[PDB]
């Protein structure tokens, strides 16, 4: 495995997808299941979208990549109250994100 400019970004996305608590985040929610989601969440995003932005070389700075992941968490907590399985999973995954990002040199 070689070392490349986007290796850290790609690695973090892979680590998040593989974590058990990533299920609320893999793809955007369906408007069929959640009719009011897109009237509430102004800038929807998910791990599939973020992965593709990494693949398509769309991030110029680590801060832009980090901001997209923070947006993903922000939307989740905005729509899902603290007592939901989504928010509980999101809380753990967000900690994992901070810890793993640090290890990869992303601040």
Author numbering: 1430 to 1536
The authors write:
Near their C-termini BAZ1A and BAZ1B each contain a plant homeodomain (PHD) and a bromodomain (BD). Our study reveals that the PHD and BD domains of BAZ1A each support BAZ1A cellular function through the non-canonical biochemical features discovered here.
The C-terminal regions of BAZ1A and BAZ1B each contain one BD of unknown function. We could not detect BAZ1A-BD binding to any of the peptides on the array. Unlike the wild-type domain, BAZ1A-BDE1515V showed substantial binding to the array that was dependent on peptide acetylation. The binding signal for the BAZ1A-BDNY mutant was indistinguishable from background and that observed for wild-type and unmodified peptides. Moreover, the complete elimination of acetyl-lysine recognition by removal of the asparagine anchor is highly detrimental to the function of BAZ1A in cells. Together, the data suggest that BAZ1A-BD has evolved to bind acetylated histones with a specific affinity, and either increasing or decreasing the affinity of this interaction prevents BAZ1A from functioning in DNA damage recovery.
